[model samples]
Target: LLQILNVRVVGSGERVVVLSHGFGTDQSAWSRVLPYLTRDHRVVLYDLVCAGSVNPDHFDFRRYDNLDAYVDDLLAILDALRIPRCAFVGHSVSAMIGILASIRRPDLFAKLVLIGASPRFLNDSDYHGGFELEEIQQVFDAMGANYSAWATGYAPLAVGADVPAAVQEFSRTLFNMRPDISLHVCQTVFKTDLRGVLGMVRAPCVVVQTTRDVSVPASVAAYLKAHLGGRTTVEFLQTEGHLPHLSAPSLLAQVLRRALARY
Candidate 1:
């Protein structure tokens, strides 16, 4: 397993919480929610191999070509810290990684909170996800054509249609990644279909869906609530974007607090 580098703030509590970010972004995505978690529980934040402050040189393409490999990195981080169990909070595709990891090692995850997640990003006959294979390919092609410009423009749309200027700047952080790595991550997220494994999740799961999420339709959240096999719950935020934690910190923190309380 790859040793994942991380930045963590220890809090005095028996419960530990790990914040896993999605592709193209890093641990900073948890900045707004960190204080909320730290005040009540031990909080850990880290970057995936290719994202954020992690070592770019350590990234292995063959290993990270799929989601399960990233899950192994998370397990390694926990193992290194001697953390036996913790609550996992993941945003976007990172949420899917948590689901897979928790199911594979049920002893490690106490609960899971998935924010702005969709089991299958690509649209199927019954699935109403916002993208099709061709549309996703076009996105990849556009990134290949111009990585910087695409990151500035494309990243905002992934979160919401009417993203704020500050939020857009936050997205530019993703531009730090190499074009090739960004393209690969995009391909993995769009092509991955985790719908079949939803039933495998045995830990309690709570899905937090944004009303105006650009990546996932509200109907898709309902779909996840219907499929996940466990004591699953769904909470809908009326916010107008995917990254509510950044745009609406207090609001998102309240939601997170409520979810944590349930576990």
Candidate 2:
């Protein structure tokens, strides 16, 4: 499982940092933020089982059915590495992975820094989760109609920036994912609601988001801060993309450093 997960523990500092990437991306998503953290923190980086960089054969729609499997993998990976406790930095879907992991085993995580996260994407009458059911349905439909075109169109929009390099990187990774796997992963992400468990996360958390994220609204971050069981604060990166680590790496790195140092 460790080999399949492609876990890497880098740097020599005593402070441990575990980085988990989100949907449509692999550990490479954090490459831009590495230099800043690795200098003083021992960082762990790995691809989620569903990451396009991983072997699609290892994915079982049945086993990877929901968020629990990803949480289990993260806990297992940390256990294998004999990490007593570490600051976890997760992006997008991986943010929920860390939240669930902390809920199940609070002692294992020192702090959880969640970037561009949301407990639900589907908006309720009062929740404002960012997507209406009809809109979300159409998104799934677009993926099914043509995955490549969906990736091409969604990449730039999600990145929310004019930078070609950021768009190109996101597009390449999004396209690397097998179509079926992408749909399965996409469905799992947009459909699963973690709001019910926000109060179960005992590990201190930080909700980080871009000022203008097309994927998650500012309201979601406020909801997290209000509902989470542990001490949680919301911070905004003055960027435009959902993937700030790619679109605004330097600024994101600065925020991450601040988040990690708090503990």
Candidate 3:
């Protein structure tokens, strides 16, 4: 297995919670949730090989071109750290990776907490992913055409319905990412579909849904809860937008603490 470096904040507990961030953002996105978590549980934070501000040279395009490639990196981190089992919390695309990894190596995961995750990102006959094939293609074109501007400029429309000041600040951070890297990561995330692997997860899972989610709607969360292999629960928050962990940290902290406590 290849070595995957990670950023960690140690705590006094036997339960280790490894955080996997979504596309577009890095490990820093989990900051607020980190402080509230470490008080009772050990937390491990790391950026995906593609999204984090890692040396571009460290990124192997062929190795990270798909979902399984990302899972390989997660397992590598666990192997290097000697963490046999822990709770896996993933946001957006990271959640799918968590489910895939847990399904493949059930012994390595105690439970999975998925935030803002969607099973099939594309709309099918019975699916309501809120996007058409052409729309997704347009998104890819938009990302490549001007990645930096899209990241910052799209955040407000993506999250805040009215575009709050903090949303603009968050957009700035998103925009700061290298355009090339951002475009590549966006394609990987948008094109991935984890529906086939939902039944493979042996660990208990939980899906958190935001009230005003712009990405995965309420119905999508229900779909995941209905199809997951192990016991799963769907919880809804009153927050708006796709990045609730950033917009409503307190709510996320409470939900996360409860979920971890159950494990």
Candidate 4:
């Protein structure tokens, strides 16, 4: 089962750090900062079931219809590795996945580093999750119109830069997934609402927000700090994109190191 997820552990330190990627990418998303992290902490990386590298045979659509399934898989990975507690660094939707996992098994997490995370994507009467329902529906429509073209166009916007290499990397990962599975995961992620679960998380959390992220806004970071149960800190990065690990690795690494040192 662990092999199915393509789990890999590196570093020699006693402390463990589990790194999780968000939608459209795999563990390779952390390549830039992996060297920095592995220098001091044993780092774990894995591909989520829907990740491009994950075997299609292992993906169970019914089970993966909700966030809880991803949480279950996270716990199972830790259990398989016999890791009692570790620092968790999750990007994008994986941030909330880490939160859900920490809520279910606080003993498994020492601290949480959430980057470009949003508890909800659609805005409500009182909440500002950044996107309107119609906007999200339009994204779905774009995806349906042509997944390849959608990836090509969305890649640059997602990276939020003129870096062609970075945009190409994002586009490659986005295009690698089966269109049906990609759309399914996209729907599940945008439809998810983890606001009520915020206060349930027991691990100290650091919410990392990018200065000009299209997917997550500064307001969402403030919301996370205000609602989170344990000690919470919101750190704003000078980076301009949602994928800071790829676009701003050095700055992201500095923030990550500082956050981990607190524990």
Error of 3 at 70 (Å): 0.8
TM-score per candidate: 0.94, 0.97, 0.93, 0.97
Candidate 3 on 209-235: residue-level lDDT in tens? 887776776798888988899999987
* lDDT per residue (tens digit) for residues 1-263 in model 4: 68999999988688799999988899999998988988789999999999988877778889999989999999999999999989999998799899999999988899999998989988988998889988889989888889998888888998996677778788889988888789989899988999988999989999998888888866898899999999999987877898989888898999999998756
Candidates 3 and 4 compared: the better one by TM-score is: 4
Q: What lDDT does the true structure give each of the candidates?
A: 0.80, 0.89, 0.80, 0.89
Q: Spell out the clash pairs found in candidate 3.
A: none
RMSD of 1: 1.8
* lDDT of prediction 4: 0.89
Candidate 3 backbone clash number: 0
Worst 10 residues of 3 by lDDT: 1-10
lDDT tens digits, residue span 1-263, model 2: 88998989888677899999987889999999999988789999999998888899999999888989989899989999999989999999999898899889888888999988989998886889888878878988999999999899999988998989999999989999989998998788887898898999988898997878888987888899999999998888877889999999999988898998856
lDDT of candidate 1 vs native? Answer: 0.80
